Amino acid sequence: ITSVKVVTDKCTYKDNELLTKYSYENAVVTKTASGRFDVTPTVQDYVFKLDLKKPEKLGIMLIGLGGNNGSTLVASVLANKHNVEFQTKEGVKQPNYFGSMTQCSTLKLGIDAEGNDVYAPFNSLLPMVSPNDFVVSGWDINNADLYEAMQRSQVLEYDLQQRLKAKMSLVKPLPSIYYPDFIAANQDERANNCINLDEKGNVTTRGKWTHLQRIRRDIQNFKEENALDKVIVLWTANTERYVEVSPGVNDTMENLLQSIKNDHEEIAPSTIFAAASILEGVPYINGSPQNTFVPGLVQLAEHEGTFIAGDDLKSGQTKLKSVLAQFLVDAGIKPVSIASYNHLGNNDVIDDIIASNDILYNDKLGKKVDHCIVIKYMKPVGDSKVAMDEYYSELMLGGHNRISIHNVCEDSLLATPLIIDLLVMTEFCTRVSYKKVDPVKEDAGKFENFYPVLTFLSYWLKAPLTRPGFHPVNGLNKQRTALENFLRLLIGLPSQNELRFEERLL
Amino acid sequence: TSVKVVTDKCTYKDNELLTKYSYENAVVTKTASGRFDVTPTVQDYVFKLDLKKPEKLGIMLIGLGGNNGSTLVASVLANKHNVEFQTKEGVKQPNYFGSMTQCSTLKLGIDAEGNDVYAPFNSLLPMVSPNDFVVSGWDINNADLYEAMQRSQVLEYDLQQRLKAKMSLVKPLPSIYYPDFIAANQDERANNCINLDEKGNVTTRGKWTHLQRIRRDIQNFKEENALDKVIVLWTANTERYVEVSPGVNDTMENLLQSIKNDHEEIAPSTIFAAASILEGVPYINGSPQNTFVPGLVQLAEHEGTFIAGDDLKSGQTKLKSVLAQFLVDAGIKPVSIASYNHLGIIASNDILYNDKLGKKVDHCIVIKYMKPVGDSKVAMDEYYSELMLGGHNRISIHNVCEDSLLATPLIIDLLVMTEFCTRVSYKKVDPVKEDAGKFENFYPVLTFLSYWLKAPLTRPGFHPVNGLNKQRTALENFLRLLIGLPSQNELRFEERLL
Amino acid sequence: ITSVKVVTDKCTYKDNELLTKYSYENAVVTKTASGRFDVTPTVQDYVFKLDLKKPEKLGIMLIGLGGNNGSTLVASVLANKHNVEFQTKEGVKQPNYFGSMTQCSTLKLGIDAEGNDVYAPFNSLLPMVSPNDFVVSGWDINNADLYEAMQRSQVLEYDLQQRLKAKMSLVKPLPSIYYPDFIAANQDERANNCINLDEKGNVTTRGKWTHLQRIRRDIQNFKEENALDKVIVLWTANTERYVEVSPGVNDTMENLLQSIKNDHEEIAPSTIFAAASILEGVPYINGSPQNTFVPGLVQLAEHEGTFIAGDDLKSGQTKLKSVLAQFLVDAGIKPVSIASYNHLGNNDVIDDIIASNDILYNDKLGKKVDHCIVIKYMKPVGDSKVAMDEYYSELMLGGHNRISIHNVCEDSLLATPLIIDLLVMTEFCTRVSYKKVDPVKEDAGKFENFYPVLTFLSYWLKAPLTRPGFHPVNGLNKQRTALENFLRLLIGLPSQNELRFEERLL
Amino acid sequence: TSVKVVTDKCTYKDNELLTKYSYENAVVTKTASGRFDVTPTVQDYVFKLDLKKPEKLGIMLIGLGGNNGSTLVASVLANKHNVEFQTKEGVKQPNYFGSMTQCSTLKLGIDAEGNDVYAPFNSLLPMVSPNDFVVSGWDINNADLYEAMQRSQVLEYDLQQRLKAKMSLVKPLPSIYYPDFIAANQDERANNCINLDEKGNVTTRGKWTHLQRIRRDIQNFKEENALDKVIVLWTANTERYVEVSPGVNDTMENLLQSIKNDHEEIAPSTIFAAASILEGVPYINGSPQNTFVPGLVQLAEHEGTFIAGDDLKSGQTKLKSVLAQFLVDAGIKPVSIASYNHLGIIASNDILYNDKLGKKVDHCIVIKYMKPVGDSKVAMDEYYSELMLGGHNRISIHNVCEDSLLATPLIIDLLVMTEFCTRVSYKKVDPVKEDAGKFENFYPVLTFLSYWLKAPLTRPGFHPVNGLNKQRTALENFLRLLIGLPSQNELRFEERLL
Numbered sequence A, C: 001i002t003s004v005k006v007v008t009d010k011c012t013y014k015d016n017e018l019l020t021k022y023s024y025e026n027a028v029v030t031k032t033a034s035g036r037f038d039v040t041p042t043v044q045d046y047v048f049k050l051d052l053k054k055p056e057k058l059g060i061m062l063i064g065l066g067g068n069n070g071s072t073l074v075a076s077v078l079a080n081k082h083n084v085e086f087q088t089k090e091g092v093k094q095p096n097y098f099g100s101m102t103q104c105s106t107l108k109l110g111i112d113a114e115g116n117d118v119y120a121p122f123n124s125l126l127p128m129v130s131p132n133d134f135v136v137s138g139w140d141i142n143n144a145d146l147y148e149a150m151q152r153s154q155v156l157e158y159d160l161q162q163r164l165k166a167k168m169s170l171v172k173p174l175p176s177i178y179y180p181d182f183i184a185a186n187q188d189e190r191a192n193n194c195i196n197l198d199e200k201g202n203v204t205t206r207g208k209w210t211h212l213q214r215i216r217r218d219i220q221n222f223k224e225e226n227a228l229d230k231v232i233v234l235w236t237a238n239t240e241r242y243v244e245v246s247p248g249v250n251d252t253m254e255n256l257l258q259s260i261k262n263d264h265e266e267i268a269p270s271t272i273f274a275a276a277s278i279l280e281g282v283p284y285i286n287g288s289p290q291n292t293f294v295p296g297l298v299q300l301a302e303h304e305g306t307f308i309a310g311d312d313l314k315s316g317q318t319k320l321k322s323v324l325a326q327f328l329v330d331a332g333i334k335p336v337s338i339a340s341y342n343h344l345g346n347n348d349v350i351d352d353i354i355a356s357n358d359i360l361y362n363d364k365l366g367k368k369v370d371h372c373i374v375i376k377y378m379k380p381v382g383d384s385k386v387a388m389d390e391y392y393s394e395l396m397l398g399g400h401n402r403i404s405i406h407n408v409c410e411d412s413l414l415a416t417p418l419i420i421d422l423l424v425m426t427e428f429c430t431r432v433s434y435k436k437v438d439p440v441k442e443d444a445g446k447f448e449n450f451y452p453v454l455t456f457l458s459y460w461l462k463a464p465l466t467r468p469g470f471h472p473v474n475g476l477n478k479q480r481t482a483l484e485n486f487l488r489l490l491i492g493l494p495s496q497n498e499l500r501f502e503e504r505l506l
Numbered sequence B, D: 001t002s003v004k005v006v007t008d009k010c011t012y013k014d015n016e017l018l019t020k021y022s023y024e025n026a027v028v029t030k031t032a033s034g035r036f037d038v039t040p041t042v043q044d045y046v047f048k049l050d051l052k053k054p055e056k057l058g059i060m061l062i063g064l065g066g067n068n069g070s071t072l073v074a075s076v077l078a079n080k081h082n083v084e085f086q087t088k089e090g091v092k093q094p095n096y097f098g099s100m101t102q103c104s105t106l107k108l109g110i111d112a113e114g115n116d117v118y119a120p121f122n123s124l125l126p127m128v129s130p131n132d133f134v135v136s137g138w139d140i141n142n143a144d145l146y147e148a149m150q151r152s153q154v155l156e157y158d159l160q161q162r163l164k165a166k167m168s169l170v171k172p173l174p175s176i177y178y179p180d181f182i183a184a185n186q187d188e189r190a191n192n193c194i195n196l197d198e199k200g201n202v203t204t205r206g207k208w209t210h211l212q213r214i215r216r217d218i219q220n221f222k223e224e225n226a227l228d229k230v231i232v233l234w235t236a237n238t239e240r241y242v243e244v245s246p247g248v249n250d251t252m253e254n255l256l257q258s259i260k261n262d263h264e265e266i267a268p269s270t271i272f273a274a275a276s277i278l279e280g281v282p283y284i285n286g287s288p289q290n291t292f293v294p295g296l297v298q299l300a301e302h303e304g305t306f307i308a309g310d311d312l313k314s315g316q317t318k319l320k321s322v323l324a325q326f327l328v329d330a331g332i333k334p335v336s337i338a339s340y341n342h343l344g345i346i347a348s349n350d351i352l353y354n355d356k357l358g359k360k361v362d363h364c365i366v367i368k369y370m371k372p373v374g375d376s377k378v379a380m381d382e383y384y385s386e387l388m389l390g391g392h393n394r395i396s397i398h399n400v401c402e403d404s405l406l407a408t409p410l411i412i413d414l415l416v417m418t419e420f421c422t423r424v425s426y427k428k429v430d431p432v433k434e435d436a437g438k439f440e441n442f443y444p445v446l447t448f449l450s451y452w453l454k455a456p457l458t459r460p461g462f463h464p465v466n467g468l469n470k471q472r473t474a475l476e477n478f479l480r481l482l483i484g485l486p487s488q489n490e491l492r493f494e495e496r497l498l
Helices: A068-082 A146-153 A158-168 A208-225 A253-261 A269-280 A295-304 A316-329 A411-429 A455-460 A476-490 B067-080 B145-152 B157-162 B164-169 B207-225 B252-261 B268-278 B294-302 B315-330 B404-422 B468-482 C068-082 C146-153 C158-168 C208-225 C253-261 C269-280 C295-304 C316-329 C411-429 C455-460 C476-490 D067-080 D145-152 D157-162 D164-169 D207-225 D252-261 D268-278 D294-302 D315-330 D404-422 D468-482
Strands: A003-006 A011-013 A017-031 A037-051 A058-063 A106-111 A117-121 A134-139 A231-235 A284-286 A308-310 A334-344 A370-372 A375-377 A384-394 A400-410 A432-437 B003-005 B010-012 B017-030 B035-049 B057-062 B105-110 B116-120 B133-138 B230-234 B283-285 B333-343 B367-369 B376-386 B392-402 B424-427 C003-006 C011-013 C017-031 C037-051 C058-063 C106-111 C117-121 C134-139 C231-235 C284-286 C308-310 C334-344 C370-372 C375-377 C384-394 C400-410 C432-437 D003-005 D010-012 D017-030 D035-049 D057-062 D105-110 D116-120 D133-138 D230-234 D283-285 D333-343 D367-369 D376-386 D392-402 D424-427
Touching (some): A017 A476, A037 A476, A037 B105, A058 A068, A058 A208, A058 A411, A068 A134, A068 A146, A068 A411, A106 A476, A134 A208, A146 A158, A208 A253, A208 A269, A231 A269, A253 A295, A269 A295, A284 A411, A308 A455, A316 A334, A316 A400, A316 A476, A316 B315, A334 C334, A370 C375, A375 C370, A384 C384, A400 A411, A455 A476, A476 B315, B035 B468, B057 B067, B057 B207, B057 B268, B067 B133, B067 B145, B067 B157, B067 B404, B105 B468, B133 B207, B145 B157, B157 B164, B207 B230, B207 B252, B207 B268, B230 B404, B252 B268, B268 B283, B268 B294, B283 B404, B315 B333, B315 B392, B315 B468, B333 D333, B376 D376, C017 C476, C037 C476, C058 C208, C058 C269, C058 C411, C068 C134, C068 C411, C106 D035, C134 C208, C146 C158, C208 C253, C208 C269, C231 C269, C231 C411, C269 C295, C284 C411, C308 C455, C316 C334, C316 C384, C316 C476, C400 C411, C411 C455, C455 C476, C476 D315, D017 D468, D035 D468, D057 D067, D057 D268, D067 D133, D067 D157, D067 D164, D105 D468, D133 D207, D145 D157, D145 D164, D207 D230, D207 D252, D207 D268, D230 D268, D252 D268, D268 D283, D268 D294, D283 D404, D315 D333, D315 D376, D315 D392, D315 D468, D392 D404
Parallel strands (some): A003 B035, A037 B003, A058 A134, A106 B017, A284 A308, A334 A370, B057 B133, B057 B230, B230 B283, B333 B367, C003 D035, C017 D105, C037 D003, C058 C231, C106 D017, C231 C284, C334 C375, D057 D133, D057 D230, D333 D367
Antiparallel strands (some): A011 A017, A017 A037, A037 A432, B010 B017, B017 B035, B035 B424, B376 B392, C011 C017, C017 C037, C106 C117, C384 C400, C400 D392, D010 D017, D105 D116, D333 D376, D376 D392
8 A cells, every 4th residue: 555654744633634734825916007917915824624534435326327437337346346357359457447537647746866756646645435435326217227238338348248247237226307308309218217207107397396305315215225424426317408597496595496396397307416415415416518507506505515516527539628729828829720520329618718818819810719519429339439629720920730639439438437536536525624724813713614616626527617706717737736736735745836946956 | 018926025126136935845755665755845045037138139040041040030020020921811910829938828816706817928027029039040051041931931922022132131151061960961052161171172170160160150240230148049950969978078178179189979069069158158959969968068067058958849749748648647548659750657657657567658759751741741649548447549649730830939939038047046045044145047957948848958867857738837937936926736725715 | 745546447537527336335134033133235336426626715604603613713724824823832833733634634545565554644535625725704693803702712822813813803703693592691792793683673583584584695695705606504603402393393394494484482593594504505514512403404404405414513522432432342341430521611422332232231231321421610721621531340250440531622622623624524525426326227327415414424523413213323433434435435445344364364 | 142144155064164255455656746556456265164163162371370360260160150249239240341252242234224233243153152261271380279369369359269169179280480581589489390400490401391391281281171172372470572593593493493402592481382383272472572583483384373462452552552543533643642550653644743743752651560559550641632723632541440350351352262263264266266276274473363462463574553443343354254244334325325
């Protein structure tokens, strides 16, 4: 086992509790009616409290348990938990979690003897839950046990599915909530595992409060049956249609909970799964694009003080594009056109970047981008995901650049480890407590929990759901920095500056 | 276009900036049982930045008649004189697109609502504009820069014509041609060399007199144009690597002597370099050859002058660097990298790169010659990584652009950043002895300029990081500290916290 | 000048008339109720009459004269006709017709002394019109003279446009016919050159017969003003919406001409330009995808005995795909998925291949293809056309192939020479006459003209319009073969067999 | 599955086919003033096709333990025994996808309505099925073919297991290993060689005895399995080119002697070839090396035996050949072709390729080694052509597939087509002397098999066409004439004419 012992007094231990002091330095900027920036620094001290005792088993309830991500996840955990080696064309492979930052990436702790960089495992600084400690279950509008889910999905090697057959067969998703009007038609017959059935087994959108109670009961039951204390709920099911945000309906907490009791039309399944989890007090992550997190719902999250994070899983084509686009502005290149294309076979941003650079995107030179996306359905590819993106930037003196990003991989294989990270991090956050510190008054204040809306998880979410007034930040590399810096911080380590003065300077 | 930060770490005399700075870091040690013991370290500093920048910066490029040279000049002239040009897409306004110092911006902090506030890279402190560049230089071929431009075929013909008049005035100085360090297929060009004999013929004998002629060239340039500040940058055909041997080039003592003896390990770039450092002028080497031999490094130290760091960073290697890094950040193991071009991290993550899995990566470089593509280069980089549970990932990067349109702004950046580091001197003060000690300037090797160089040069014992993101982060954080701001943390605690 | 003197008696000369005899051998195939093919050969002799005296100037009337193709065409002719060298980054270039089969490709005449292949220019066998002999004019719903058309188009080098400025400025398209309901909205204001205006300059779809007469008068006037004898009309304007084929309307000749007089709703501009040309007796080529050639219209073509050819211009991405797809079946590979994408910035098949191979596409193995096309609008590319096509075929024993075709070029630059070929060939066809020959009776029969619907031109058209009962053939390579073989034929040369027995055999 | 054509050019005796054929062509001559004078030429022939095909064809592959070898075997077994296998996409049925003879079809003519009628390639005349293949062969490494299969990693693991039992039975024969013609990094494999000495060690001395051992191997194979027809195909690691010199390999006389003298220009493939021709067995060479030296060609002529034509045609070069041709058919000048791979027409059109424009094309071959990609190869071919009026075209071809899955069916095709040409003898009759003369068989070099070979072999004085379309057209037209049908004309006169 690997661990780090940071020798600092900025933090101490008191009963599986790590207490760290930290001086958060920022700066406020102003502008003069003549073009000037008046930067006034800011400082604010805190004391962070990390509950060192992590759960021995972490509950995981997936909405879409039978899909590609859902089945693959369980597959992975089981495989890894049991060291279920498997056969392939390349021979017997050992199971792993490649693609997981939390589980495979490293972080620089500082320099060694010879002034050279030293890295450690992302999870070797502070105690995080091992995905091998996940106790996974969930819901799905389809009853197929997880082995049939694997067969159907076609993501994992045939030999591996067979070695997992025995156990994966015993895992059957709980009946879920189905409201037909919220998803693409082709999911009709797929639904044969619904908790919402009228007096005669017929999907009925009426009685949504009865449904809200069920999911909640479901969570409570999943917990006691597994002797678990902690559980997180992650939505990874078909994308619902966007829901309209209208005053009187879901604008406030009261109006949302009401609409649920009135069986309102703007109340969706995820809204119910979301509302439940929160009232149940368990973190809820929205791995899909729809806007289940309406203002009224958010208020509930804040009131109950329960974690939430969401809006899509940022993977492959979407990451590799965030890095490519950023990089092109960090060099002062103006990417004009951007053709993006997709197409899979299974049952499945630049505006902020174009705003950070004003010498490229102003009024005289221009500030527009012809970005046209595309995800056609080429079923004849199973889970193989081909993704082409081409940027046609502008160079000095009339020249142009033309960069292409051709991508091809088993999508749900990248998605699973990403889902794993979201859970490992959100569970870790459920143990971080912080207290603001008055410089002129000792131990003033009571420890608090992260503001409900956990934005630290954005590195994995495509549309970071931020709190009101705050504009989202999609810079992928930046997103990771906040993560490591935050962990660095928690053990008494400074934020990376990359200055290297024990080399730049005599 | 100006940043006025209110901190007590900065005080201004008469065109001089003084800044306090608590530099933090940490030393790590993996115990026997693989347990990292890390000890934090803080070192206080005081930097001095001469606020009076040169009103005109002198630039001498070796290989001024090439693609990069002529394009650099044309850009300066074009921008400086706002010369617009005609194209199929209509009239265009010149610019320095691609230049980080000219077209990039930085995050100063947040505004009232908690949103990010950005400002131009150059807007913080004062830096010299490329419009204030006075450019000259050497070249074994003597074609005036119009002809150099025509010959390069990288710039629009209408623009090329509009600059004809001024570009014609610029003619490169004769250079040192040691035919043994290039390719004899580079003899048609060599009609402008100083190193000649009585038979008029080119010669490799009399290297010290050649060296003195370059010094002369620099003085003449400075006086002739009435300049105080001049910078030299190599952007000429790559040279064959020279062997570093004792008693010849291992010391600045032997070096100056081997140059007097005409030693076979003394290359043209070796002369230009030494001739530049002797004239106290900075020297950037934008080619792969190892000019900065050890002995040559001492001379720079002794003379207290600046030196660069091997080969101009290509746009492909910029991306390969950025992207390949991103793969390891995600936890994905790129077991293969079969890339190859042509034209007219295993040390970071060891969880995937260890003697348990696979500490190796299939890499190969392939640049070929295809005269017809013109200045337009094409680059292909295929990445084959393995995912969890037997899966694999295949990513390809296709790139096409006129190389020079990318090297030029990158050259401008280096020049603007060297000139900057020129007006920066620091002092390592202790908290147990205020204002004690004299100011030294940046170590001879301006390692801060590794963002624009493929093979970063270094001070022995240390491995240079090639991570572009971090190579830009370091630089960005330097500007910040210099004006009292701290290193970006990205923690956004006024949003993540109550 | 290059020419070929074929020493054969299969043909002789009589007053600028080349008379060639030819024995066309084919074979009829049958199938047995047990799986067998009863192939019974066929022979039929003919005498071809080629009118050797080609027109000194060929009239060309383009519908879309102001578009990219229209302007570029005139540009090219003028440039080439006058040897208008021009400046570029690569220096002074000489004008040419690269991309033109008719003008640049070669054909094998046979072997030399040493048994090695000998090729000659596609136009060096029989006399064809030089595009430098084109007298171009036309119509367009926009008045911009052709120089403004060039500027607007942005296809040609800036320096070349300037050297052509003088002359191109004097070329202004004739007013055209505009029926708003037949095209994408964005062509509204673009229309300021219309012949159809009510009592007060307002586009009116009424009086279509008045319009029919105009175009006809237009053609007659274009001819006499240029002292021309021959003229061809090529449609290269915005794509109209498809027209419904309904009985009583355009099913027969009588019903079509009637609907025009009744100002019918299913009568489109091209229908009128098409009907006119035909009644005027000039070949009409449809360079666009719409179905202007309805049955009723076709009947008129046959009755008047006037040439017609049509339905889209087959270029780049569409050719290179016809060759790629064919080739994959000629090797017995089954291409399953096929992702095709496009996107330009200007004002702008497998079913038969999957039917020729029954060992790959049957009922047990399957006979489907997930072909999804795409042409998004990335205006920020001028005329640069990026085209990506990716095929995911199947190999023996579960393996797969993945081939990509990345294409990028100035589209209208490929289109122009293609348009040139269509005209050179159709004009050449207007001089080929043929007489069937009775083996047991001398000089029986009167010479005839190709059946109206000229299918020889398909090598350039995407959807070959064939006569009733006949299924179209899209095999590009095959299409060219018929062209060379036909020319070979006309000078007394056998069809290529590639047998090479003076090498395969002792 | 059977074609019965009704023509008078074909008559059938007792398992013998006789066909009349008027072969037409023409001789051209460019006069002084560049005017082609063409004189047509007709030559009558009479072909004889032995209608009785072997009930079991013998196959001996040199390098039977490689990727191609083991895959060839596995396919035959899989197909022959209808062994289905499991995959992520579910159960699959074996097949010979990719094989032209097995999965391609031909146009026989048109039906009632005037539409094209197609029939399987093999359906016309009778050809041997790959299911009737009895395969054996040599290999310097002695791993049984299961292990060879495991080692190759080209076939699905479930399929691989399902064939384990039968594949294990197949073990390659010892081969001739002259370490000097390959790569010493090929010594770990060589644990199965016949050419040994008393110190047991491998030796290059005694080449004639090695040659006699191969003959022995062939006889033993034929008798052991009770076969009359056997074919040999080289599919082993490429050999270093050998120099053709007089008095050593310029004649079949010198050749058989140099082989007796142990000459340094006698390679293993040189032995297998000669040993094959001496046993009267056909020999296909699917590697680049020039085994078929001149002297070795004479032996084949004298013995009246068949020989192949250098290197198995890759799927990339198949496309490069097809596509590049298509460009010249359109009139587009591909002034550049910067292509390159890696893994685990200027003579036709002279209107663009003349000393007025540019008779040159930027071409370069680049195959590299990237162990990790597995059997999956990736190919990139970029084409930069010029269009009319200063424009340009850039086309790229990306290709990824498991090479062997493409070489195997191509190998099967060659084998099925050689066996076919084996039962074909012709006669050159005159119209001025009926039934006069004896039947000869296809010239030693089966040039009809250039569709599946990169570097077509030839009879001196003639340049082989590499145009795949035409290389397939020639073949297709042969089947046709053999059964009375004429060469495809594509004139479709029953539609184009009234």
